[PDB]
């Protein structure tokens, strides 16, 4: 009567409370697809904006956490900003006490521990978001690390999130089997944006206009988000493919 109401174990050895977080993640209906280019990492995501009255510039799910670390958020937007604030903060602190900008690997493990503690309390609600941290590291190159509400994480050759992500996982897996090279290759980042957009148009069975895309690319020593004006120049570049 109380075993699925705080994060204690059940007669099964499972934690249902921790499990319900994983059933909250996919209720926003926002998809993400992230591939590691040759010397960049490109992540493309939907940006659903329901009503006319939202100001669209403000609607986002690409958060700048450092110069080198972006963080792409699938799950409810309150939990998104609290995971995002804690991330920026920890990035500052690392810089402060160790004298170099924070490498992604370490931020991945740092937000993982905070996730772990949140399921070993009784007064803390695990944040129900899957965050994907995309980067370009100077020791380990372009990487993708995906953390989740439990506190597990693993690196990725590519990863996807959302409720239609079973589909996206299928396209990317075929792609890296056929080619037989773990990461996508193409030198210019602009064209990894093109390959990436095709794979979202094939998988979801939907076309995308400029206000429906919001694209983040971590290249070397900088993270930017493409303006919706610049995303159209990419949508045209798919018309000559």
């Amino acid at each position: 009567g109380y075993d699925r109401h705080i994060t204690i174990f059940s007669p099964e050895g499972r934690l249902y409370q921790v499990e319900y977080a994983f059933k909250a993640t996919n209720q926003t209906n926002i998809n993400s697809l992230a591939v590691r280019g040759k010397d960049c990492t490109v992540v493309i995501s939907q940006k659903k904006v329901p009503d006319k009255l939202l100001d669209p510039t403000t609607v986002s799910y690409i958060f700048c956490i450092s110069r080198t670390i972006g963080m792409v958020v699938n799950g409810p937007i309150p939990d998104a900003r609290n995971a995002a604030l804690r991330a920026k903060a920890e990035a500052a602190e690392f810089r402060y006490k160790y004298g170099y900008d924070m490498p992604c690997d370490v931020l991945a493990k740092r937000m993982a521990n905070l996730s772990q503690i949140y399921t070993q309390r009784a007064y803390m609600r695990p944040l129900g978001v899957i965050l994907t941290f995309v980067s370009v590291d100077e020791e380990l190159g372009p990487s993708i690390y995906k953390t989740d509400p439990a506190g597990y994480y693993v690196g990725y050759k590519a990863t996807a999130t959302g409720p239609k992500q079973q589909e996206i996982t299928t396209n990317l897996e075929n792609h890296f089997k056929k080619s037989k090279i773990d990461h996508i290759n193409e030198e210019s980042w602009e064209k990894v944006v093109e390959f990436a957009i095709t794979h979202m148009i094939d998988a979801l069975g939907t076309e995308f206009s400029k206000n429906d895309l919001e694209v983040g690319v971590a290249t070397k020593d900088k993270f930017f988000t493409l303006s919706a004006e610049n995303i159209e120049e990419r949508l045209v570049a798919i018309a000559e493919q």
Partner: protein, 249 residues
């Protein structure tokens, strides 16, 4: 705030401690891991597991170095291992590397992490950790030694044992194949052979993470010329090196 200062491990009425019993269910859900104690090394072994092939296994870790003389490998939950490895490195420095200046013996460090266990089988707002660890190591006076730290917070010294979902079948194989002289190279052939019968998915030098606590390598020491210190005894085996010994079955 915090008002959770009451234990959520409580006595059950026909006896036993219900949370610790439950947590041991959660141990036997996870991967299979084993350890064989020789006369000159200890070998530890585990299987990698991913969501999809899109995960990398290269950046994954499941066998960790706590001190250069003492490694750990788990079977149970991924999250709980991850924090408890870090608390193990922490108490090992703070309570024997600042006080007696050196890494602690294997008996001592085991005893500290059982007390980390103990203070989440108790206190408020906490449940038990959901791993069982083998903490294998080498100290200078109890030899090579293999331990099993558990959700209860007990420890048992072992000579070969297994934990995880294939534990029941594994140890019977290991009871009959044990011998009172093994070399470390001969130890390996047992551990691989057993771990092959508990895998049914793919088998490679990239999907079996294997570690030896052999004998000293000065090529991992990082430096030369103080002969007083002798390099990592712990040495995780690369994918290439493991693959030869797989063919050797």
């Amino acid at each position: 705030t915090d008002r959770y200062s009451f234990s959520l491990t409580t006595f059950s009425p026909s006896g036993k401690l219900g949370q610790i019993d439950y947590a041991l269910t959660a141990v036997k859900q996870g991967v299979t891991s084993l350890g064989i104690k020789a006369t000159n090394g200890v070998v530890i072994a585990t299987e990698k597991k991913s969501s999809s092939p899109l995960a990398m296994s290269e950046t994954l870790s499941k066998v960790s170095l706590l001190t250069p003389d003492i490694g750990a490998v788990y079977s149970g939950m991924g999250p709980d291992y991850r924090v408890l490895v870090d608390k193990s490195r922490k108490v090992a420095h703070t309570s024997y590397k600042r006080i007696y200046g050196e890494y602690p013996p294997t008996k001592l460090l085991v005893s500290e992490v059982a007390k980390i266990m103990q203070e989440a089988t108790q206190s408020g707002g906490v449940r038990p950790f959901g791993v069982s660890l083998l903490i294998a190591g080498h100290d200078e006076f109890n030899g090579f030694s293999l331990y099993q730290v558990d959700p209860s917070g007990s420890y048992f010294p072992w000579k070969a044992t297994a934990i995880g979902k294939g534990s029941v079948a594994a140890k019977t194989f290991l009871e009959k194949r044990w011998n009172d002289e093994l070399e470390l190279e001969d130890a390996i052939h047992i551990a691989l052979l057993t771990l092959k019968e508990s895998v049914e998915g793919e088998f490679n030098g990239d999907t079996i993470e294997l570690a030896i606590i052999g004998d000293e390598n000065p090529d991992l020491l990082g430096y030369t010329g103080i002969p007083t210190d002798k390099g990592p005894r712990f040495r995780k085996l690369t994918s290439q090196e493991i693959n030869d010994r797989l063919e050797a079955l």
